[PDB]
């Protein structure tokens, strides 16, 4: 298994827009249409993704080319960032996946914002982290996906997901 298949499981696949629970507009494979407080720019901002005048629903295609674009994405913000690719450098490849699995969910500067964990990750304190990741606002929205990405960090294995 790799960050791709492990992803795909966490996001789902839909062709049309949707909303998730903080009202966030997301299509595809967890694809956020924008950052924006504005319903307007959301179409706007999908269609410029999309290289098209959009009437609201994509291709399979489309989907995974975004998802390409935003596993990319991840990654390379997790390397631009001071406080994540300390992080990322020193775990494993399995671990590696679930940070940037994170960072795909969250965005760079909200998965920054888990200092303690960070540090602890860092330090390889598997367990420590674990726990102190599972008493967050993360994992109170998003329970089932928090769980499987912390039993990824503790074990160090694909478990969660196979
Ligand atoms: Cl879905
Ligand atoms: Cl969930």
New binding site residues.
């Given amino acids: 298994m790799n960050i791709f298949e492990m992803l795909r499981i966490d996001?789902?696949?839909?062709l049309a827009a949707?909303a998730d629970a903080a009202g966030y507009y997301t299509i595809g494979i967890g694809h956020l249409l924008t950052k924006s407080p504005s319903l307007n720019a959301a179409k706007s901002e999908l269609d410029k993704a999309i290289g098209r005048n959009t009437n609201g629903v994509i291709t399979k295609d489309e989907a995974e080319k975004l998802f390409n674009q935003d596993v990319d994405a991840a990654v390379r913000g997790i390397l631009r960032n001071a406080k994540l690719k300390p992080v990322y450098d020193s775990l494993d490849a399995v671990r590696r996946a679930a940070l940037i699995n994170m960072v795909f969910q969250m965005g760079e500067t909200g998965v920054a914002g888990f200092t303690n964990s960070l540090r602890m990750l860092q330090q390889k304190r598997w367990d420590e982290a674990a726990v102190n990741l599972a008493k967050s606002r993360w994992y109170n929205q998003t329970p089932n996906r928090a769980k499987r990405v912390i039993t990824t960090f503790r074990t160090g294995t694909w478990d969660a997901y196979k």
Avoid at 11 to 14: I, R, T
């Fill in positions: 996001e789902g696949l839909a949707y």
